[PDB]
Amino acid sequence: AQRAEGPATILAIGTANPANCVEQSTYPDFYFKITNSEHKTELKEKFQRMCDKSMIKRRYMYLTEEILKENPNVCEYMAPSLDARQAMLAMEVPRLGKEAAVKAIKEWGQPKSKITHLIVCSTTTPDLPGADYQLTKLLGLRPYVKRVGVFQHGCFAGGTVLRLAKDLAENNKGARVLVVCSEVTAVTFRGPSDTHLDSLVGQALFGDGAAALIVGSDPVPEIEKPIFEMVWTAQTIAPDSEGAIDGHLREAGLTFHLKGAVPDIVSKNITKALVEAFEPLGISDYNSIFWIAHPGGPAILDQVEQKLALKPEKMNATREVLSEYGNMSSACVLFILDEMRKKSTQNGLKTTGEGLEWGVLFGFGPGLTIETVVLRSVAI
Amino acid sequence: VSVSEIRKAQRAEGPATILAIGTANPANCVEQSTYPDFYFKITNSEHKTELKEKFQRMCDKSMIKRRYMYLTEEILKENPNVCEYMAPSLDARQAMLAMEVPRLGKEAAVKAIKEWGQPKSKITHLIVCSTTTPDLPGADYQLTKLLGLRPYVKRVGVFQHGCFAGGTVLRLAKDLAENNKGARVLVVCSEVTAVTFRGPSDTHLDSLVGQALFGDGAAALIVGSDPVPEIEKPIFEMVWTAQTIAPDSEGAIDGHLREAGLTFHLKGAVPDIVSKNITKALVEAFEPLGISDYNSIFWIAHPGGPAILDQVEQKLALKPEKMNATREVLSEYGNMSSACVLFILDEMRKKSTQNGLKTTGEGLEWGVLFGFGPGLTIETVVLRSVAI
Numbered sequence: 182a183q184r185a186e187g188p189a190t191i192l193a194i195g196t197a198n199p200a201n202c203v204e205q206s207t208y209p210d211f212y213f214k215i216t217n218s219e220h221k222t223e224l225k226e227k228f229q230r231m232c233d234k235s236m237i238k239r240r241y242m243y244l245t246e247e248i249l250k251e252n253p254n255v256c257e258y259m260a261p262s263l264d265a266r267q268a269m270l271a272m273e274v275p276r277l278g279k280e281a282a283v284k285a286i287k288e289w290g291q292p293k294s295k296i297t298h299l300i301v302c303s304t305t306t307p308d309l310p311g312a313d314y315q316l317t318k319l320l321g322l323r324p325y326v327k328r329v330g331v332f333q334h335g336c337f338a339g340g341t342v343l344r345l346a347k348d349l350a351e352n353n354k355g356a357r358v359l360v361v362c363s364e365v366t367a368v369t370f371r372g373p374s375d376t377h378l379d380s381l382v383g384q385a386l387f388g389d390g391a392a393a394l395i396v397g398s399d400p401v402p403e404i405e406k407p408i409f410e411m412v413w414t415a416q417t418i419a420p421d422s423e424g425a426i427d428g429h430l431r432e433a434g435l436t437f438h439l440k441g442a443v444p445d446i447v448s449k450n451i452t453k454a455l456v457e458a459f460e461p462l463g464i465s466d467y468n469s470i471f472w473i474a475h476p477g478g479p480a481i482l483d484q485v486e487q488k489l490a491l492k493p494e495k496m497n498a499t500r501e502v503l504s505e506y507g508n509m510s511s512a513c514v515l516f517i518l519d520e521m522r523k524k525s526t527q528n529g530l531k532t533t534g535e536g537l538e539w540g541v542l543f544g545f546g547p548g549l550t551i552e553t554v555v556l557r558s559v560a561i
Numbered sequence: 562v563s564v565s566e567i568r569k570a571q572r573a574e575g576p577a578t579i580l581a582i583g584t585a586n587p588a589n590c591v592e593q594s595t596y597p598d599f600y601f602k603i604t605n606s607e608h609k610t611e612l613k614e615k616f617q618r619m620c621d622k623s624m625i626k627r628r629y630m631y632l633t634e635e636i637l638k639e640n641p642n643v644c645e646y647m648a649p650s651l652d653a654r655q656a657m658l659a660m661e662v663p664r665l666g667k668e669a670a671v672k673a674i675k676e677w678g679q680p681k682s683k684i685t686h687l688i689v690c691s692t693t694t695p696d697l698p699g700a701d702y703q704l705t706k707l708l709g710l711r712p713y714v715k716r717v718g719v720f721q722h723g724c725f726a727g728g729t730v731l732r733l734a735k736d737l738a739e740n741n742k743g744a745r746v747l748v749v750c751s752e753v754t755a756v757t758f759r760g761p762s763d764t765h766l767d768s769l770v771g772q773a774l775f776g777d778g779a780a781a782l783i784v785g786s787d788p789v790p791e792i793e794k795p796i797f798e799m800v801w802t803a804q805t806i807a808p809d810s811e812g813a814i815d816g817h818l819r820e821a822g823l824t825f826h827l828k829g830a831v832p833d834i835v836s837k838n839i840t841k842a843l844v845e846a847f848e849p850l851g852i853s854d855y856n857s858i859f860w861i862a863h864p865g866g867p868a869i870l871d872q873v874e875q876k877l878a879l880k881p882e883k884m885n886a887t888r889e890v891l892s893e894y895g896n897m898s899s900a901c902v903l904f905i906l907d908e909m910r911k912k913s914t915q916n917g918l919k920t921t922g923e924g925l926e927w928g929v930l931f932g933f934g935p936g937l938t939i940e941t942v943v944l945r946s947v948a949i
Contacts, residue, residue, distance in 0.1 A: 184572075188564050188568050263820050304697075307817070308816060310936030311720075311721045314935075324805055324808070325805040329729075329733065330722060331717075345717065348736045410564060413567070418705070426697075430696065547697040
């Protein structure tokens, strides 16, 4: 009587962001000023076009004007600054993650002493113990909670944590898994450089945020309220994409090397992933399922939409999150699930999935990995 | 189709079982008896006569005969900051790990797959563990590339967990294999001291003890539920798992990844904390089985240090033979972090076969595996042996 009976189900969702709201319209002037680069006028025009095409209205950042003034080495492009950044991360990642987790637990409505497993995900973690240990302490969870830390996986990790939570919940009766994704740009922020150009795109897209979930099989009637059910999962590496998205954790912090073929590679490989997931269910109409896609950038969304001839409405929840929060790495897809279920309830639809039955969630990231998670909605 | 019908046809049936084990170590073998002279010379610290005496004592009582290290005198001579106690050297260490962790891990994996005997294309999941990883993609990606596994292998990287992670990967493999029909999980723990090696300091004796104990190595396993009779060959079966944090131990073992690489800091007495919390971990795991005599089960314990083994043995009044397998690995390889407990499982099963015992667990039926590490974490895995 140790294994569970039904499908792993999402029972709650909560999110959080740093208090500092940064409007995109005025970021270019701010960015080039704080990094003492107002004189490279031309390079500011390149960044100007990147922000105008980003389709982002605002982002939230732990890094404030004061903190940047406190750390000149972080404002240069490549200066020794890892130690300073690790200190910021050791405090903020767990704090922001706790804020989101508290809201998820409140929605769930059960004692925190009932949480049996914990999965914590962040692009990087500064020490040993990892962030999972820190969050266990800050939330006051059972000392014997089973922990798993997911670090340096990157932008596709929203799918990864769902994939892990599914097996932990389904193979253990009574198991209730707290999942937390917390991302903070203190590890990636740096000054502009007309040489390292691709590093510039991250400064125009990346933002801060955290999202938490409670996942479990065999929901208790009325006491717990299902939102979405997980059905099948997969992970794969796109062919001829090595180096498409690289990252290096060094003494100058974390630097990225993402080329311009990214949008092309993702969209060209999206069809195979969909067939692998839905052909077994006899589903061929991709406008008949609800969508959740990691908004790595606007181009990825435009080409997937064009490639499959999706109605513009399919990418709505995804584009709404990109517009109001920017690219929060692993946390994005979880924010999108929240936006979709809230919007559906708001407009009086019949299911948490915009009134539809089946859906799909995609994570995209380093090693040009594509994570796929098939979902099913819940009535009303 | 309904989700219910899908779930029913998706799950596996029996308990996760270890089907093969393989290990590997760097080619450079370092004798312990003469390490003090070697270490103080390469770090240009021969004028620290008193400090060297202390280190000689540490090495003499470590119960380690030798270790294998990727770091050689030639490499050390090319990286001057790596020889200092705390100088800017992370970038150089990252380049070393980027190559060695995946290379050493692949060597062990090839041996495990050979024993298993089945196509590499049938591996559905991959778990790679290492104290740290230098880039994005993580080491799990590189191993997949080096081995040529199917691109759709489901991967999970376990980084910055530490010395207790040997238990962590078994705990994860248990759920991945048991909840997915046909799943075959390749598990790899690869540890390289290039990330922790540093010069001696008379104000950081805890860092120095680490220089006397840590060694390099990798271990690989194939784990799966529902073994094909007479084709696949079960070695050990997993029964139950647990993880806990010892009370009042925050600070006992901590590491920091910084510009000077990875450093460790201790607080209190680790051996005492482990030995005082071990009985409760055992009672909770074996009470349900009706076992109170710990000399009646086979043992696998993370050899963090010789003192932990001595105190555990004394606390439970174990016969000398109980720790044979554990002490053999500590003696022949040193503390290889997460990989240790996996080397011990291999030693125990090989010796049981060699000396004619009736089960892979020294002729006994039940056994236990313990992992100890940062945030004073204790991982417990209950095991059942296999006949002959």
